[PDB]
Structure 1
Amino acid sequence: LKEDMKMTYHMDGSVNGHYFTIEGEGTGNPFKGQQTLKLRVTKGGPLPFAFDILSPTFNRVFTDYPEDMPDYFKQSLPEGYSWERTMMYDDGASATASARISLDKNGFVHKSTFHGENFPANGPVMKKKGVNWEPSSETITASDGILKGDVTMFLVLEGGQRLKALFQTTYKANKVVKMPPRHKIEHRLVRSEDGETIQLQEHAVAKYFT
């Protein structure tokens, strides 16, 4: 595990019954909690929905942890960890996702799935009006060898509105590691697109409360 890591991605997903596959590569500094991803829709493109609902699916190894706080995700290496997530939007839409994070010769291997339903056909998600997620603060809590994350998310939309969603995640290392206290992770995730690709950049930093 070094300062200059590489990643690969594969997602099989669907939204409102429209199925798609996404693949890509990434680079990042896991110790500074920084990563940059380059993704392509390899099947089912172009996506008839705002890519932002998928972007948090695309790795808490890339979190800047204080030196004296147990780092659940870096401890999980080389075997890695997996997670499962529910996402409940304020308009009644809902989605689930899961991913497995592992390592090979090249670096991190990220395999994920995504299932979303009941996004209003004429709402901002299905009309591709997302801009970016607001910076967020996810509360991490520990119990029985696993972590649970809670974060209220706000998707910035065109025209100055925001769409709220509640994210809940269970992170599983699948081997015994030293467990951290209750803490928070501050995220900043931004997206850029060019017709052929999607770029994601996340900066994530873990902090103690107060």
Structure 2
Amino acid sequence: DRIFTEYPQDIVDYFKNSCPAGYTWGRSFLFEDGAVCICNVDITVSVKENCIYHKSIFNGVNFPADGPVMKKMTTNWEASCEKIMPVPKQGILKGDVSMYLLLKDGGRYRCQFDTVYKAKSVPSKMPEWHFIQHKLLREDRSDAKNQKWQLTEHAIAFPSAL
């Protein structure tokens, strides 16, 4: 959910602007060992409840049986820098980020995210290409009965530093 991104005043905030009607995205995941995941999400703001609804479909295949995913060898995603580019005539954005999953051995596991961010409303203002920096942590809090875990994120939009 790219609404939970601190935007400075001088970069156009496509996601917050799309609200409350919301937006939809699709993302491909390409892992270095050939697994492929796709995700589709529908984000809508009920202003009555002051609440943000997420409806996600998530599919993935060809994770090797003894790979770090199926064997649960992963701790966290390494902190990242995503490139958000506009698509001038279609009024949509395109995410491109290279992601690393840290293995409990101290190594890495690479995935390519390619996202298409597409607002439900035809947007007035289109942003210029900028960056988003994310830090996403996970803590498993599984008990005897249910499997549960917590996530925390922090995302900030930036222009080029130069």
Q: What does 1:10-25 correspond to in 2, within 5 Å?
A: none
Selected match of 1:161 from 89, 104, 107: 107
**Aligned positions, number:** 152
**Corresponding position of 1:205:** 156
Query: Separation in 2 of the partners of 1:69 and 1:141?
Result: 12
Correspondent of 2:117 among 171, 174, 180: 171
TM-align CA RMSD: 0.8
**2:5 is the counterpart of 1:63:** yes
Q: CA offsets per residue over residues 41-65 of structure 1, 9 Å max, x none?
A: xxxxxxxxxxxxxxxxxx0011000
Cα deviation code 1:99-143 (max 9, x no counterpart): 010012321000001000000000110001110000000000001
Secondary structure of 1:159's counterpart equals coil
**Aligned to 2:85, what secondary structure does the other structure show?**
strand
CA separation in 1, counterparts of 2:111 and 2:20?
Answer: 33
SS in 2 for 1:160: coil
In the TM superposition, structure 1's runs of 4+ consecutive aligned residues that sit over 3 Å from their partners are: none
Whole-angstrom distance in 2 between the partners of 1:97 and 1:176: 23
Deviation at 1:209, TM superposition (A): 1.1
Structure 1 counterpart SS, 2:6: coil
Whether 1:124 aligns to 2:71 is no
Structure 2 CA distance for aligned equivalents of residues 173 and 141 of structure 1: 14
Output the amino acid matched with 1:146: I
The alpha-carbon deviation at position 146 of structure 1 amounts to 0.2
User: 1:128 aligns to what SS in structure 2?
Assistant: coil
Q: Distance in 2 between matches of 1:113 and 1:209?
A: 33
Q: Cα deviations across residues 66-101 of structure 1 (Å, max 9, x unaligned)?
A: 112110000001100000000000000000001010
Counterparts in 2 of 1:42-191, with a 5 A limit?
59-104=1-46, 105-106=48-49, 107-143=51-87, 144-177=90-123, 178-191=125-138
**What whole-Å deviation, never above 9, does each CA across 1:4-28 have from its counterpart, x for those lacking one?**
xxxxxxxxxxxxxxxxxxxxxxxxx
Q: Normalized against structure 1, the TM-score is what?
A: 0.71
- Structure 2, unmatched stretches of 5+, are none
Q: TM-score, normalised by structure 2?
A: 0.91
